[PDB]
Amino acid sequence: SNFAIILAAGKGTRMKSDLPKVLHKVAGISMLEHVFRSVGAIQPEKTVTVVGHKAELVEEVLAGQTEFVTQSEQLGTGHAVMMTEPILEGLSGHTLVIAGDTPLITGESLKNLIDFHINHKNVATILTAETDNPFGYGRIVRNDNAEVLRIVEQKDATDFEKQIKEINTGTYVFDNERLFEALKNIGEYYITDVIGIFRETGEKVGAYTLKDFDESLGVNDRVALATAESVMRRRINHKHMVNGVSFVNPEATYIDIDVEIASEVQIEANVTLKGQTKIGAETVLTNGTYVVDSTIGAGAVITNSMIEESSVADGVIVGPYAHIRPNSSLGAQVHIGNFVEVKGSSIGENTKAGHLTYIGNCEVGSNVNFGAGTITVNYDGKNKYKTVIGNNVFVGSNSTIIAPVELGDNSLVGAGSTITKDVPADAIAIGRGRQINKDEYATRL
Amino acid sequence: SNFAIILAAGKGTRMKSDLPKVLHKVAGISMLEHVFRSVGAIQPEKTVTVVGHKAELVEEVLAGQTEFVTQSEQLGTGHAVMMTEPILEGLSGHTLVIAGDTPLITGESLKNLIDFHINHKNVATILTAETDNPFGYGRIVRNDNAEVLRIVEQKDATDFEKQIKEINTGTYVFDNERLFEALKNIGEYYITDVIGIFRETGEKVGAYTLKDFDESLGVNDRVALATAESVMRRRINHKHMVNGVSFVNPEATYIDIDVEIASEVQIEANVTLKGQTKIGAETVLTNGTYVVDSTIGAGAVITNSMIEESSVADGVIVGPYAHIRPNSSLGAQVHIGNFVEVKGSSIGENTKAGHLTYIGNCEVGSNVNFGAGTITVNYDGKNKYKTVIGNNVFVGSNSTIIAPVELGDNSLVGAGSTITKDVPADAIAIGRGRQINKDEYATRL
Amino acid sequence: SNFAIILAAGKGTRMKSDLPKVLHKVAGISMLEHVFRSVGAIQPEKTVTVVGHKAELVEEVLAGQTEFVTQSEQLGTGHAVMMTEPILEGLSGHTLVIAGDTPLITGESLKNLIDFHINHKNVATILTAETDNPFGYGRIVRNDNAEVLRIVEQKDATDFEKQIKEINTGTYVFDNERLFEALKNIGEYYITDVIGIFRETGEKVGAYTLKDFDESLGVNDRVALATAESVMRRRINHKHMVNGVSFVNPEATYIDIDVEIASEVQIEANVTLKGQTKIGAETVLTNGTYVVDSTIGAGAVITNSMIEESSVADGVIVGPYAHIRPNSSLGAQVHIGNFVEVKGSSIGENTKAGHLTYIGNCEVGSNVNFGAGTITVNYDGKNKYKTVIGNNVFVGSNSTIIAPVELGDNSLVGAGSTITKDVPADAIAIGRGRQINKDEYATRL
């Protein structure tokens, strides 16, 4: 039986933020979420998460996927662990104590932490790591037989102890029953003082050493937040590359934790993919493309464009400098060119809009052609209207389509026309001015 | 006499691609091409390239610059080298065996490989390298006199041999005659088994050690492809910096292998230069500028813009957010502003188009001024027409020029005009509507 | 008493530039300026800067903040220091000799250099550093008692001396009086030969060792210029992160030396902030945003946009792909959308311009709405006019406003209208064409 307690009560003053430290994001989700995900690797029978500062905000994040307990005042990690008492004391198993500000720790590492605690029948196993610059961290003191004696911080550290490279990551696995009993024995309570109690009784204490020290990073400020962003960024992009995705520069490409990318997808440097984004097979993404919560089919080419909460079928060609705003759909083989904005509209297959065009709140059929400079109007300073555009409609360049209006199938709008009324199918609509040339007049200008 | 065999038959399954592994690109050209380029450094009397998977595709790449031989089924490097038999066996010299998936290997290194093979009168010289993590590679076993005894992989590797840091790069130089005779002696044939034959006869075998281990990289997946991209990117940008080109961030600037850049050229981070692109002296390129197969004169400023298959004279100012599409020319001192697209058109010197304008299929003279919002129409849903614009023509803002039409020299198009007929020189053309004010009417809106 | 001499006479041939080497920029200001800034940390009673090549250009940079002396021909560092004679010889103190091509050297390091020179009563203290690749640099020879004997370059370096890791950074602190007297004793004069004179007299010579070797970088070419850019970039971004600014990628974000950023400001990768730029609290900046000499209030969101010499109040939402040109102001909560350009205009609070719009030379009130495709005209091929737009004016989509004109409060411009005359308050202005439908006509197209 395995149990788990997630520490997430500290405020994080070095962050210079009012947001709970653990809620700061890394590659899409909060640090707390990354921690919770690694936890499930040991399939915890019960999971308790200690909260404190702005408990409301935090509870919204992991609501329903773990139990909670509130900590009034910051009375240390010991008091924090004591809040888990009403729910855990009286259960046989291994209770892992992990902080929520260590996003890089992986599930496999926690499995390894649990397997070690069992294999060595320890009463308390400490996840440690080695570094050639141990300044600040508590050091793991052992003996000639490699047995873990005690953790000593830089307040009780003698010169001989000040050289120990093996440090404490602040992540442990304790024997449930013994843990809460030893907490009653111990100006703040430290979870580390629990090891002192076990020592007096000569109870078995071990230490699992993390292979990658950097995986133990504890985020206390934004400098470390960026480092977490760095490790996580590399991790994610590595996986994608193994999955058959080419990266011009995986070190400078920004893909969120939950983004899905098919094989053969080619991604240039400086591409941003955020939220619930999916990329179909063979799709090409160029430098500057920014996608938020969108689905992109296969064989599509997104050249330096921004796509938010929209769907993009296969064969779609977009950009450069195009903007696909929320609630839009681009049918197969649709072409959206430079300086074109599509907002809250559905675009049928093969429709072309290659230049300086605004399509807002429109239902557009297939094989439609938007001439450069076409503007659709839906707002009047109060109300929002809709326009229906049929299949095979040719919309003249520099035209203005004023909603509500419907352009029937195979309709044609003359260039420079201002359309206020419906255009029946197969009809042509013109509404501009006639050209008048005046000789020798450009001489007076 | 020096000979050369280029191995390029493997499929590369870890790539998760149907494209031949060696054809994957790095900084503009295929890995195979980078390899071929290093080869010519030893001026090979004859060059044979072993192919296999999709031989057609590969042959198009190096057609006419090297001989070829096809390998039916993947029967190992030994069989691959045996395909070179009909063309090489019976020649006196040094035959270099290099794989096409090692893009970073330089010509100077191969020269050094050939010079070592000669200076030491070896029958087989192995290009090796040292690493502190030799897991996977075959290890070079020597003796107390430093003589190369044999290569041992991780299948015959004893614990004492499992610690050797000197590994085999998979690149060799063999004595031509002996090579093909020893191949007849040896479930797949390995080019490494050839060294076993030489050992039995006590024939001289040496090893040239690469100074930079990373130069030996063998691309088997996209992770390594990106690493090659990384090394090659740095290499190219280093050269440019030595040639007098400033880089804000050479680690995050993407310049293809054959791009030419003059001195004093200033390049901000995140600039992309692809294909046959040339940059004149003192030209400034800002973050986001993307250039494909284009020539740019001196003293030009390209601010966050995209230029494809076009020519840009000196003093040209472009951007930000401008798009110069295929088959365009921008005369000297031409100014193209934000959200302006130029497609298949010639633009005379000093012509200005600073805002939200589309110029497609036009021949434009010098000193022309395109008012913001000017649209040129050439397409009607079937045909593409052309428009001629003379010198000193002032094109009114928000005007629509409908091809085929000609605006004579010093002509003027009134703002908001829709032009369908030619405008004679020195004439003015207007074709809009008159303004009508209605008092107290905006009260009912 | 502390004195200072700044060496800035070399041309820098490996730069392949006509600009004085020291004037090349790093994170906004010249290398020379970074040097001068570190100098003031020791509060120099008198500061002399040695110049030579294009002395005019250099003097403009540090004019009034330091004294100058010109060097006719390049006769070495010794001659350069001798130019300081007329102003310094005859003063009691410590004269620091620093070159202007070492931008990374910090003020704290120079303070430490001065404090060491005093604490050890040296006649000449040498700022040295250790590296495992000392090729090229002069090596600090000491003895069994750690006393500094002499500096030996790679021309007099014996094999035993060729292994010394401690090198000379080219930065020193000499006893003023002795310095200029020893210069008269010594085909070019070297400041290093001064140590030889002190040795003959057995005068005390020490060496302060820089903790960070990379801080000693001397820029001789653009490769090193980029490295300086790299260190300086990291330094600046580190400070900001400590000040509470989040960075997705501090390694790929470009912020000039004097930029000011408030806490809680969120900055995505690839953001550029240049010159005298200020960022208010909580403001969000996305990938591609480029800001030059501008002020941005709090809570603003700048999505992939370019803002030059302008002011942006709080709550302003900009982008993507927007261009705020010189001399503009955006009142609170102003919204500027994609492909919109604002030039030399003031925009009142809550005014919206969300699409393909050009606003040049306009004074615009609050609560104004610019419909997509709105164009303002101010140029006629000679003169520049101005337009006044009141509060609550609704400007129709695809309209053309021709200056000089005034749109009174609560005015309305019909979509597609070409406005040439003032529109009184509460009035509506229309000037387009009527729609005419022709049945079965789109059949012949």
Side-chain angles (χ1 to χ4, degrees):
Chain A
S1 301
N2 294 334
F3 301 105
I5 173 187
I6 303 170
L7 308 180
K11 183 179 182 178
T13 58
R14 285 160 57 202
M15 290 295 177
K16 293 197 171 183
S17 171
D18 264 273
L19 180 76
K21 196 173 71 167
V22 299
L23 291 190
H24 279 89
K25 305 180 180 178
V26 170
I29 61 186
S30 71
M31 300 192 296
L32 174 54
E33 290 178 78
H34 287 280
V35 175
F36 178 80
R37 289 185 182 194
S38 301
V39 164
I42 64 181
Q43 49 247 288
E45 191 175 284
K46 299 175 185 183
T47 301
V48 185
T49 303
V50 181
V51 300
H53 176 70
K54 291 182 178 181
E56 182 49 43
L57 297 177
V58 184
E59 290 181 76
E60 301 175 43
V61 187
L62 296 180
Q65 45 200 352
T66 179
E67 300 181 62
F68 303 107
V69 285
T70 306
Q71 174 175 14
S72 300
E73 188 175 277
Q74 291 191 80
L75 297 173
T77 53
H79 176 88
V81 180
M82 281 208 94
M83 299 304 103
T84 308
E85 180 188 279
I87 303 174
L88 285 189
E89 183 157 43
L91 301 171
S92 178
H94 322 305
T95 301
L96 179 142
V97 185
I98 194 175
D101 59 351
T102 52
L104 319 183
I105 304 180
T106 66
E108 183 181 272
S109 289
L110 300 186
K111 294 178 192 173
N112 287 347
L113 190 56
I114 286 297
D115 287 13
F116 185 89
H117 184 91
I118 296 173
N119 252 243
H120 286 95
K121 304 163 187 172
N122 296 320
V123 173
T125 298
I126 304 173
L127 180 67
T128 67
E130 297 183 29
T131 175
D132 220 61
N133 200 320
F135 182 70
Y137 314 79
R139 301 156 210 235
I140 317 300
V141 182
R142 299 182 179 227
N143 55 15
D144 62 311
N145 193 239
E147 306 173 323
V148 182
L149 307 181
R150 51 198 169 280
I151 298 172
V152 187
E153 297 212 82
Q154 301 221 277
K155 285 191 175 183
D156 313 271
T158 68
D159 290 327
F160 176 62
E161 301 183 313
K162 287 179 177 180
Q163 55 80 55
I164 298 186
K165 305 305 175 183
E166 184 185 10
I167 57 91
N168 169 222
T169 69
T171 303
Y172 326 80
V173 174
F174 298 109
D175 178 84
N176 195 46
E177 286 182 34
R178 281 296 298 130
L179 173 61
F180 292 106
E181 296 175 348
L183 288 172
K184 303 168 183 177
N185 299 321
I186 60 177
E188 297 175 276
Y189 293 172
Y190 301 121
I191 188 61
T192 48
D193 297 337
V194 174
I195 74 168
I197 301 303
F198 292 160
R199 175 72 177 165
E200 306 179 341
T201 312
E203 294 178 273
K204 212 170 188 297
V205 177
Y208 183 63
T209 314
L210 269 179
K211 288 119 185 180
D212 175 22
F213 163 81
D214 305 308
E215 181 186 321
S216 76
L217 183 73
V219 183
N220 303 313
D221 63 7
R222 294 164 193 223
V223 171
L225 187 71
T227 297
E229 192 64 49
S230 193
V231 172
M232 193 60 75
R233 177 169 54 238
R234 184 172 313 118
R235 183 186 291 181
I236 291 171
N237 294 350
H238 180 92
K239 174 199 60 190
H240 289 310
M241 292 191 285
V242 172
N243 293 350
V245 179
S246 296
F247 278 75
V248 161
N249 190 5
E251 285 298 294
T253 304
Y254 318 93
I255 302 170
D256 280 359
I257 186 68
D258 293 329
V259 176
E260 293 171 78
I261 313 172
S263 59
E264 292 185 293
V265 163
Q266 297 184 94
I267 312 183
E268 285 190 356
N270 207 56
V271 170
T272 301
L273 305 184
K274 291 161 71 61
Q276 318 308 306
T277 294
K278 297 183 177 57
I279 311 298
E282 299 170 296
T283 294
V284 175
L285 307 175
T286 73
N287 192 304
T289 282
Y290 196 120
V291 192
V292 186
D293 298 330
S294 297
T295 48
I296 304 185
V301 190
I302 314 295
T303 308
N304 202 0
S305 300
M306 191 178 194
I307 304 175
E308 304 158 42
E309 304 165 21
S310 297
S311 43
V312 185
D314 300 37
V316 182
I317 314 302
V318 181
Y321 314 117
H323 193 197
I324 311 303
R325 297 186 75 189
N327 309 314
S328 293
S329 56
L330 311 183
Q333 297 179 88
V334 161
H335 291 191
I336 303 297
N338 52 207
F339 330 119
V340 177
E341 176 198 2
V342 177
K343 179 193 71 180
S345 307
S346 55
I347 314 300
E349 314 188 338
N350 309 283
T351 286
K352 299 185 176 182
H355 350 243
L356 304 142
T357 287
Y358 171 45
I359 293 167
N361 230 59
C362 296
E363 178 184 292
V364 189
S366 63
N367 302 277
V368 176
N369 185 279
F370 290 91
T374 292
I375 301 292
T376 58
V377 183
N378 61 349
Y379 188 60
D380 65 343
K382 196 174 186 179
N383 315 276
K384 291 281 191 176
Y385 299 115
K386 190 182 180 178
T387 283
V388 181
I389 300 183
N391 317 325
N392 299 274
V393 173
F394 194 88
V395 182
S397 296
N398 241 347
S399 291
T400 314
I401 315 299
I402 305 176
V405 156
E406 177 177 9
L407 303 175
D409 304 325
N410 302 269
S411 241
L412 178 145
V413 180
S417 298
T418 292
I419 305 296
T420 51
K421 298 159 188 167
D422 305 333
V423 182
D426 294 300
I428 66 163
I430 301 174
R432 56 191 184 205
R434 304 174 187 115
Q435 187 179 339
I436 300 174
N437 293 342
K438 295 282 189 173
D439 279 316
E440 74 179 302
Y441 271 71
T443 300
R444 306 176 188 139
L445 301 165
Chain B
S1 301
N2 294 334
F3 301 105
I5 173 187
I6 303 170
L7 308 180
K11 183 179 182 178
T13 58
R14 285 160 57 202
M15 290 295 177
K16 293 197 171 183
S17 171
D18 264 273
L19 180 76
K21 196 173 71 167
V22 299
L23 291 190
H24 279 89
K25 305 180 180 178
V26 170
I29 61 186
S30 71
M31 300 192 296
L32 174 54
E33 290 178 78
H34 287 280
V35 175
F36 178 80
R37 289 185 182 194
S38 301
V39 164
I42 64 181
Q43 49 247 288
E45 191 175 284
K46 299 175 185 183
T47 301
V48 185
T49 303
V50 181
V51 300
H53 176 70
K54 291 182 178 181
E56 182 49 43
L57 297 177
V58 184
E59 290 181 76
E60 301 175 43
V61 187
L62 296 180
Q65 45 200 352
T66 179
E67 300 181 62
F68 303 107
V69 285
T70 306
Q71 174 175 14
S72 300
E73 188 175 277
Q74 291 191 80
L75 297 173
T77 53
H79 176 88
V81 180
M82 281 208 94
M83 299 304 103
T84 308
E85 180 188 279
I87 303 174
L88 285 189
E89 183 157 43
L91 301 171
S92 178
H94 322 305
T95 301
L96 179 142
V97 185
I98 194 175
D101 59 351
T102 52
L104 319 183
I105 304 180
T106 66
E108 183 181 272
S109 289
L110 300 186
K111 294 178 192 173
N112 287 347
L113 190 56
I114 286 297
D115 287 13
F116 185 89
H117 184 91
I118 296 173
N119 252 243
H120 286 95
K121 304 163 187 172
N122 296 320
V123 173
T125 298
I126 304 173
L127 180 67
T128 67
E130 297 183 29
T131 175
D132 220 61
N133 200 320
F135 182 70
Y137 314 79
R139 301 156 210 235
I140 317 300
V141 182
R142 299 182 179 227
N143 55 15
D144 62 311
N145 193 239
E147 306 173 323
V148 182
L149 307 181
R150 51 198 169 280
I151 298 172
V152 187
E153 297 212 82
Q154 301 220 277
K155 285 191 175 183
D156 313 271
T158 68
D159 290 327
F160 176 62
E161 301 183 313
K162 287 179 177 180
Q163 55 80 55
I164 298 186
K165 305 305 175 183
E166 184 185 10
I167 57 91
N168 169 222
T169 69
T171 303
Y172 326 80
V173 174
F174 298 109
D175 178 84
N176 195 46
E177 286 182 34
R178 281 296 298 130
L179 173 61
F180 292 106
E181 296 175 348
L183 288 172
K184 303 168 183 177
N185 299 321
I186 60 177
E188 297 175 276
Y189 293 172
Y190 301 121
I191 188 61
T192 48
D193 297 337
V194 174
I195 74 168
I197 301 303
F198 292 160
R199 175 72 177 165
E200 306 179 341
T201 312
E203 294 178 273
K204 212 170 188 297
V205 177
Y208 183 63
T209 314
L210 269 179
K211 288 119 185 180
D212 175 22
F213 163 81
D214 305 308
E215 181 186 321
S216 76
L217 183 73
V219 183
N220 303 313
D221 63 7
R222 294 164 193 223
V223 171
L225 187 71
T227 297
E229 192 64 49
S230 193
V231 172
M232 193 60 75
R233 177 169 54 238
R234 184 172 313 118
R235 183 186 291 181
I236 291 171
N237 294 350
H238 180 92
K239 174 199 60 190
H240 289 310
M241 292 191 285
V242 172
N243 293 349
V245 179
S246 296
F247 278 75
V248 161
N249 190 5
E251 285 298 294
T253 304
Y254 318 93
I255 302 170
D256 280 359
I257 186 68
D258 293 329
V259 176
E260 293 171 78
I261 313 172
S263 59
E264 292 185 293
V265 163
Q266 297 184 94
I267 312 183
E268 285 190 356
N270 207 56
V271 170
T272 301
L273 305 184
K274 291 161 71 61
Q276 318 308 306
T277 294
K278 297 183 177 57
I279 311 298
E282 299 170 296
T283 294
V284 175
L285 307 175
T286 73
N287 192 304
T289 282
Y290 196 120
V291 192
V292 186
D293 298 330
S294 297
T295 48
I296 304 185
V301 190
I302 314 295
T303 308
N304 202 0
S305 300
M306 191 178 194
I307 304 175
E308 304 158 42
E309 304 165 21
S310 297
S311 43
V312 185
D314 300 37
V316 182
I317 314 302
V318 181
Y321 314 117
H323 193 197
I324 311 303
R325 297 186 75 189
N327 309 314
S328 293
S329 56
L330 311 183
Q333 297 179 88
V334 161
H335 291 191
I336 303 297
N338 52 207
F339 330 119
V340 177
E341 176 198 2
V342 177
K343 179 193 71 180
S345 307
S346 55
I347 314 300
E349 314 188 338
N350 309 283
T351 286
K352 299 185 176 182
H355 350 243
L356 304 142
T357 287
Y358 171 45
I359 293 167
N361 230 59
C362 296
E363 178 184 292
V364 189
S366 63
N367 302 277
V368 176
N369 185 279
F370 290 91
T374 292
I375 301 292
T376 58
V377 183
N378 61 349
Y379 188 60
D380 65 343
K382 196 174 186 179
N383 315 276
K384 291 281 191 176
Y385 299 115
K386 190 182 180 178
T387 283
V388 181
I389 300 183
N391 317 325
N392 299 274
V393 173
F394 194 88
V395 182
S397 296
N398 241 347
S399 291
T400 314
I401 315 299
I402 305 176
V405 156
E406 177 177 9
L407 303 175
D409 304 325
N410 302 269
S411 241
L412 178 145
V413 180
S417 298
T418 292
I419 305 296
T420 51
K421 298 159 188 167
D422 305 333
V423 182
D426 294 300
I428 66 163
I430 301 174
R432 56 191 184 205
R434 304 174 187 115
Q435 187 179 339
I436 300 174
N437 293 342
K438 295 282 189 173
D439 279 316
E440 74 179 302
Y441 271 71
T443 300
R444 306 176 188 139
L445 301 165
Chain C
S1 301
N2 294 334
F3 301 105
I5 173 187
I6 303 170
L7 308 180
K11 183 179 182 178
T13 58
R14 285 160 57 202
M15 290 295 177
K16 293 197 171 183
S17 171
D18 264 273
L19 180 76
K21 196 173 71 167
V22 299
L23 291 190
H24 279 89
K25 305 180 180 178
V26 170
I29 61 186
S30 71
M31 300 192 296
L32 174 54
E33 290 178 78
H34 287 280
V35 175
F36 178 80
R37 289 185 182 194
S38 301
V39 164
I42 64 181
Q43 49 247 288
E45 191 175 284
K46 299 175 185 183
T47 301
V48 185
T49 303
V50 181
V51 300
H53 176 70
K54 291 182 178 181
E56 182 49 43
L57 297 177
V58 184
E59 290 181 76
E60 301 175 43
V61 187
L62 296 180
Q65 45 200 352
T66 179
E67 300 181 62
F68 303 107
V69 285
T70 306
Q71 174 175 14
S72 300
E73 188 175 277
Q74 291 191 80
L75 297 173
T77 53
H79 176 88
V81 180
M82 281 208 94
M83 299 304 103
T84 308
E85 180 188 279
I87 303 174
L88 285 189
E89 183 157 43
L91 301 171
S92 178
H94 322 305
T95 301
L96 179 142
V97 185
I98 194 175
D101 59 351
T102 52
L104 319 183
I105 304 180
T106 66
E108 183 181 272
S109 289
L110 300 186
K111 294 178 192 173
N112 287 347
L113 190 56
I114 286 297
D115 287 13
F116 185 89
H117 184 91
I118 296 173
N119 252 243
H120 286 95
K121 304 163 187 172
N122 296 320
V123 173
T125 298
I126 304 173
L127 180 67
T128 67
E130 297 183 29
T131 175
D132 220 61
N133 200 320
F135 182 70
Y137 314 79
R139 301 156 210 235
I140 317 300
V141 182
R142 299 182 179 227
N143 55 15
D144 62 311
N145 193 239
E147 306 173 323
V148 182
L149 307 181
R150 51 198 169 280
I151 298 172
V152 187
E153 297 212 82
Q154 301 220 277
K155 285 191 175 183
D156 313 271
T158 68
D159 290 327
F160 176 62
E161 301 183 313
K162 287 179 177 180
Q163 55 80 55
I164 298 186
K165 305 305 175 183
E166 184 185 10
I167 57 91
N168 169 222
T169 69
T171 303
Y172 326 80
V173 174
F174 298 109
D175 178 84
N176 195 46
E177 286 182 34
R178 281 296 298 130
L179 173 61
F180 292 106
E181 296 175 348
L183 288 172
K184 303 168 183 177
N185 299 321
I186 60 177
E188 297 175 276
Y189 293 172
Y190 301 121
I191 188 61
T192 48
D193 297 337
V194 174
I195 74 168
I197 301 303
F198 292 160
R199 175 72 177 165
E200 306 179 341
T201 312
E203 294 178 273
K204 212 170 188 297
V205 177
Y208 183 63
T209 314
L210 269 179
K211 288 119 185 180
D212 175 22
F213 163 81
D214 305 308
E215 181 186 321
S216 76
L217 183 73
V219 183
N220 303 313
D221 63 7
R222 294 164 193 223
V223 171
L225 187 71
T227 297
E229 192 64 49
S230 193
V231 172
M232 193 60 75
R233 177 169 54 238
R234 184 172 313 118
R235 183 186 291 181
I236 291 171
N237 294 350
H238 180 92
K239 174 199 60 190
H240 289 310
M241 292 191 285
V242 172
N243 293 349
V245 179
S246 296
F247 278 75
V248 161
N249 190 5
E251 285 298 294
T253 304
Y254 318 93
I255 302 170
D256 280 359
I257 186 68
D258 293 329
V259 176
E260 293 171 78
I261 313 172
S263 59
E264 292 185 293
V265 163
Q266 297 184 94
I267 312 183
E268 285 190 356
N270 207 56
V271 170
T272 301
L273 305 184
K274 291 161 71 61
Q276 318 308 306
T277 294
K278 297 183 177 57
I279 311 298
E282 299 170 296
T283 294
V284 175
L285 307 175
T286 73
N287 192 304
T289 282
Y290 196 120
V291 192
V292 186
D293 298 330
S294 297
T295 48
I296 304 185
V301 190
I302 314 295
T303 308
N304 202 0
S305 300
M306 191 178 194
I307 304 175
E308 304 158 42
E309 304 165 21
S310 297
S311 43
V312 185
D314 300 37
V316 182
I317 314 302
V318 181
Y321 314 117
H323 193 197
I324 311 303
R325 297 186 75 189
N327 309 314
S328 293
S329 56
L330 311 183
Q333 297 179 88
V334 161
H335 291 191
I336 303 297
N338 52 207
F339 330 119
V340 177
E341 176 198 2
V342 177
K343 179 193 71 180
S345 307
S346 55
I347 314 300
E349 314 188 338
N350 309 283
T351 286
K352 299 185 176 182
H355 350 243
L356 304 142
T357 287
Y358 171 45
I359 293 167
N361 230 59
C362 296
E363 178 184 292
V364 189
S366 63
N367 302 277
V368 176
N369 185 279
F370 290 91
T374 292
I375 301 292
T376 58
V377 183
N378 61 349
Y379 188 60
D380 65 343
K382 196 174 186 179
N383 315 276
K384 291 281 191 176
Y385 299 115
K386 190 182 180 178
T387 283
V388 181
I389 300 183
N391 317 325
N392 299 274
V393 173
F394 194 88
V395 182
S397 296
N398 241 347
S399 291
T400 314
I401 315 299
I402 305 176
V405 156
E406 177 177 9
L407 303 175
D409 304 325
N410 302 269
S411 241
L412 178 145
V413 180
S417 298
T418 292
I419 305 296
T420 51
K421 298 159 188 167
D422 305 333
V423 182
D426 294 300
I428 66 163
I430 301 174
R432 56 191 184 205
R434 304 174 187 115
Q435 187 179 339
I436 300 174
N437 293 342
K438 295 282 189 173
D439 279 316
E440 74 179 302
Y441 271 71
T443 300
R444 306 176 188 139
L445 301 165

